[PDB]
Each structure stands twice: as C-alpha cells, then as structure tokens.
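hey so i finaly got around to running the thing on E(rns) glycoprotein from Bovine viral diarrhea virus. pasting the sequence first so u can double check i didnt mess up the copy paste, my clipboard has been acting weird all day
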Amino acid sequence: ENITQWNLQDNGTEGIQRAMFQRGVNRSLHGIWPEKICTGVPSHLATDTELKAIHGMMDASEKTNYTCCRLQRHEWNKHGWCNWYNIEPWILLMNKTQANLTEGQPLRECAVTCRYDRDSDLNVVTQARDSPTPLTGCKKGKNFSFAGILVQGPCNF
Ligand SMILES: *[C@@H]1O[C@H](CO)[C@@H](O[C@@H]2O[C@H](CO)[C@@H](O[C@@H]3O[C@H](CO[C@H]4O[C@H](CO)[C@@H](O[C@H]5O[C@H](CO)[C@@H](O)[C@H](O)[C@@H]5O)[C@H](O)[C@@H]4O)[C@@H](O)[C@H](O[C@@H]4O[C@H](CO)[C@@H](O)[C@H](O)[C@@H]4O)[C@@H]3O)[C@H](O)[C@H]2NC(C)=O)[C@H](O)[C@H]1NC(C)=O
Ligand SMILES: *[C@@H]1O[C@H](CO)[C@@H](O[C@@H]2O[C@H](CO)[C@@H](O)[C@H](O)[C@H]2NC(C)=O)[C@H](O)[C@H]1NC(C)=O
Ligand SMILES: *[C@@H]1O[C@H](CO)[C@@H](O)[C@H](O)[C@H]1NC(C)=O
Ligand SMILES: *[C@@H]1O[C@H](CO)[C@@H](O)[C@H](O)[C@H]1NC(C)=O
Ligand SMILES: *[C@@H]1O[C@H](CO)[C@@H](O)[C@H](O)[C@H]1NC(C)=O
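ok and heres what it spat out for the 3d tokens, dont ask me to read them lol
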C-alpha cells in the first residue's frame, strides 16, 4: 500500500548520490509514502533528536552536508504525521527500513531514475523503489547498475 523509495550512490550525480559515493553509502532512504500526502499543520513538530534516530538515512540537502534533518523533517511533514499519527512508530519503521537498506540490495528493488553512463554503457540507478514504475533517464536495452550491482532489467533481486 506504501511506496518505499531510496537514493543510491552515484559519483556521476551531483548532490546526495555523489555524497553517498564519497562516504561509501549504497542506499539511503528517501521515504515511505502512503497514498495520502499530508496537508495542513502537523500534529507534532519533529525534533532533530527524533529525526537522527533514523540511522543511516542521509539528508538530500547540502545545507547539512547530507546528514540530518531537512529531508527527514520534510518526510514527516509531508507523509508522516497524517498517516502514522505519532512520530514514534514512524521513526521505528523508517529506521528499520533504513537498517534493511543498509544490509544490502532489498527484496524488491526497481529503478525509478537513472543516469545513463556512456563510459560503462550502464543505466546507473540513482533512485529505486520497492515496486515497478515508469523510468526516467534510463536508456532502452541497457543493463542497470544499483550501487555497483549489475542487473538485466529495471528490477533487482
Ligand atoms: C503503510 O502506511 C500506513 C500509513 O498510511 C501505516 O499504517 C499506520 O501504522 C501506524 C502503526 O505503525 C498506525 O499508528 C497507530 O495509530 C493508532 C490510531 O489507530 C487508529 O486510528 C486510525 C485512523 O484514525 C485507524 O487505523 C486503522 O486503519 C486500517 C483500516 O481500518 C487498519 O490498519 C486498522 O483497522 C487500523 O486499526 C484505526 O481506527 C486505528 O485503530 C494510535 O493509537 C497508535 O499510537 C501508539 O499508541 C499510543 C497511544 O496508545 C501513542 O501515543 C504511541 O506513541 C503509540 O506508538 C499509532 O499511532 C496508524 O493507524 C496506521 N495508519 C493507517 C491509515 O492505517 C502502515 O503500517 C504502513 N505499512 C507498511 C507495511 O509500511
Ligand atoms: C527488514 O527485513 C526483515 C528480513 O527480510 C523483514 O522480516 C521478514 O518479514 C517477512 C514479511 O515481510 C516475514 O515473512 C519474516 O518473518 C521476516 N524475516 C526475518 C528473517 O525476520 C522485515 O519485514 C523488514 N522490515 C522493513 C521495515 O523493511
Ligand atoms: C556497498 O556496495 C558494494 C557493491 O555491492 C559492496 O561491495 C560494499 O561492501 C557496500 N558497502 C556498504 C557500506 O554497505
Ligand atoms: C562533509 O562531510 C564529509 C565527510 O564526513 C567531509 O569530507 C567534509 O569535510 C564535510 N564538511 C564540509 C564543509 O564539506
Ligand atoms: C535503528 O536501527 C539501528 C541499526 O541501524 C539500531 O541500532 C537502533 O537501535 C535503532 N534506533 C531506534 C530508535 O530504533
């Protein structure tokens, strides 16, 4: 029912993808997205201490040097409060999702966005999710690279 999406390292993509490559991070959670997007005022304002409890999730912002908490707070504000009601079960789910992502390539890993790399003739996956979706920036007929793992098609197992 929820889309789980994450960033993947890629030295060829400026921003979080490059920062992850430099730090030896392969997968960094972007979000867990139910159908409903939160509108209005959050029932609770996420603190830095709460957001830092999602261990290994890197912020997409250079303003924190890709650490915490701009993306983490944005996730709680836009997808968290209205769906989970309380920050505690959301922090635990996000943290466990990230822990699984840190362990290696997950159960279902489908490409979302690629950076086609001319040199290696590979579709370098910059963002993946746990369900198939139409692709963006992915060259037809090329193999896919999920944080160095070579796959035939857009979905990795
Ligand atoms: C996919 O995303 C959804 C979010 O869309 C995730 O579901 C959410 O999971 C949260 C648990 O992790 C759960 O949080 C608890 O919510 C209760 C309140 O629950 C009651 O309210 C809601 C609506 O008002 C109803 O939820 C029911 O919805 C479904 C269909 O009816 C079904 O799942 C089931 O019937 C649910 O019961 C329902 O009326 C609820 O009973 C809070 O009380 C919880 O609080 C915990 O308890 C404390 C107080 O005792 C609180 O202070 C603590 O901090 C404590 O931890 C807790 O917040 C959400 O209700 C649920 N949201 C929805 C819309 O279902 C789902 O888990 C995701 N799945 C995956 C696999 O990623
Ligand atoms: C993190 O990974 C573990 C291991 O895959 C998950 O636990 C499994 O959950 C499935 C159902 O989704 C069950 O069939 C098994 O009981 C579990 N296996 C083990 C070895 O414990 C867990 O769901 C994952 N959590 C998140 C949030 O991704
Ligand atoms: C990241 O992925 C590569 C390629 O699969 C693997 O060799 C390496 O050990 C992983 N590093 C971490 C920190 O998980
Ligand atoms: C950003 O983080 C990395 C690794 O932790 C480090 O190389 C760098 O000095 C940090 N700070 C700035 C201002 O780039
Ligand atoms: C989150 O997962 C880590 C492993 O990455 C674990 O050590 C830690 O206790 C967890 N934190 C919370 C708040 O669950």
